[PDB]
Ligand binder design. Structure first.
Ligand SMILES: OC[C@H]1O[C@H](O[C@H]2[C@@H](O)[C@H](O)[C@@H](CO)O[C@@H]2O)[C@@H](O)[C@@H](O)[C@@H]1O
Ligand SMILES: OC[C@H]1C[C@@H]2N[C@@H]2[C@@H](O[C@H]2O[C@H](CO)[C@@H](O)[C@H](O)[C@H]2O)[C@@H]1O
Length: 341
């Protein structure tokens, strides 16, 4: 009852910086988003960071090998065997260095790493293919690189921004630039957002291998409404698709999106997380994703947080629970998920 689960994916963000390592407390400092219907910036000082919560590890660097060790030990505590790494195609030496550091640290703990392909500028199926080839070439032989039944796995965020007719070229076995039957074949997991009438043909026509839902906030989309998960799984099974619902402990992003309060989901001392995780397991899925390890801007993190009140902000915290509660509660749910597999 302590081993890692390799069908449990935890979304991980490597974009945090410190002045010492990165030259700026990157992401702890963050622009405040204008209201879609100034706004200024959060300066990323000790007192004022771009989160409604406050990390136990402080304003850390994602490139600090000592932080990475600590994070891998947290994954072990949570029993989450796969780190699903945000990937922004920065094409810079700092990105390349950090990915290697994360793979190296993960391997010491038998954690695996897969990539979460983000909506980088001009993303399209051709440069996606080239980037999948690059990632598999660079990292595919690393011992921590994830495979499921012989295949890499990628999550594709906001996949609906690319038309199914383009996806088909990459993901159908007959597609013009197919990855199927090549050295670069992979399980491609697209984002299910809206109603079945839209999403079912999208997924089929795009030739995705499966789908995930991402959002930690229940009801934000059809896909992130857990009462839909039984029927989504039924459809997945009938159509040979892998459904990987995303569960999270809460949501709050109002430091960076002050206009977005309607998306707040309160943690209620863990009861929100328990409810969402239970629904995923009851749906009878093969794999679960966790939003998130450390999306601190969106308040979905399971990473330890501490009480903190500064002269600039009174942070939220884990209340009646201890800082590592969400790690240990994840481990509880991983056990229940395994019991179901
Ligand atoms: O606008 C706030 C909203 O922004 C982000 O989500 C956007 C997009 O990535 C999603 O696919 C669609 C889903 O309908 O919504 C937005 O356009 C997220 O940061 C989200 O959590 C946030 O509420
Ligand atoms: O990993 C998928 C998304 C997770 C999270 N909603 C953000 C998206 O990133 C945008 O918003 C971040 C702040 O929450 C911002 O730092 C980043 O630059 C944005 O691209 C992720 O795409």
């Amino acid at each position: 009852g302590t081993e890692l689960d390799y069908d449990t994916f935890c979304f991980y963000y490597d974009w945090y910086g410190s002045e010492a390592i990165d030259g700026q407390y990157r992401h702890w400092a963050h622009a405040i988003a204008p209201d879609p219907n100034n706004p200024g910036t959060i300066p990323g000082t000790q007192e004022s960071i771009a989160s409604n919560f406050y990390p136990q590890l402080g304003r850390y660097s994602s490139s600090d090998p000592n932080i990475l060790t600590k994070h891998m030990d947290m994954f072990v505590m949570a029993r989450t065997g796969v780190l699903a790494l945000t990937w922004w195609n920065e094409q810079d030496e700092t990105e390349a260095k950090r990915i290697g550091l994360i793979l190296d640290a993960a391997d010491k703990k038998k954690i695996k790493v897969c990539f979460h392909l983000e909506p980088y500028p001009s993303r399209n199926v051709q440069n996606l293919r080239e980037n999948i080839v690059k990632l598999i070439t660079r990292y595919g032989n690393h011992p921590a690189f994830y495979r499921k039944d012989g295949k890499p796995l990628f999550f594709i965020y906001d996949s609906y921004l690319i038309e199914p007719s383009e996806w088909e070229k990459l993901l159908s076995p007959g597609g013009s630039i197919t990855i199927r039957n090549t050295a670069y074949d992979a399980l491609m997991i697209g984002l299910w957002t809206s109603s079945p009438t839209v999403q079912r043909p999208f997924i089929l026509n795009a030739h995705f291998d499966g789908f995930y839902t991402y959002f930690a906030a229940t009801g934000f989309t059809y896909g992130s409404t857990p009462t839909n998960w039984v029927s989504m799984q039924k459809w997945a099974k009938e159509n040979g698709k892998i459904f990987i619902p995303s569960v999270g402990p809460g949501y709050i992003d109002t430091r960076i999106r002050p206009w977005n309060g309607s998306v707040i989901r309160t943690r209620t001392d863990g009861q929100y997380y328990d409810a969402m995780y239970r629904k995923a397991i009851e749906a009878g899925v093969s794999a679960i994703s966790i939003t998130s390890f450390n999306e601190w801007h969106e308040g979905s993190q399971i990473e330890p947080a501490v009480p903190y009140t500064s002269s600039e902000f009174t942070y939220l915290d884990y209340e009646n629970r201890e800082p590592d509660y969400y790690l240990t509660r994840t481990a509880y749910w991983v056990g229940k998920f395994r019991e179901s597999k």
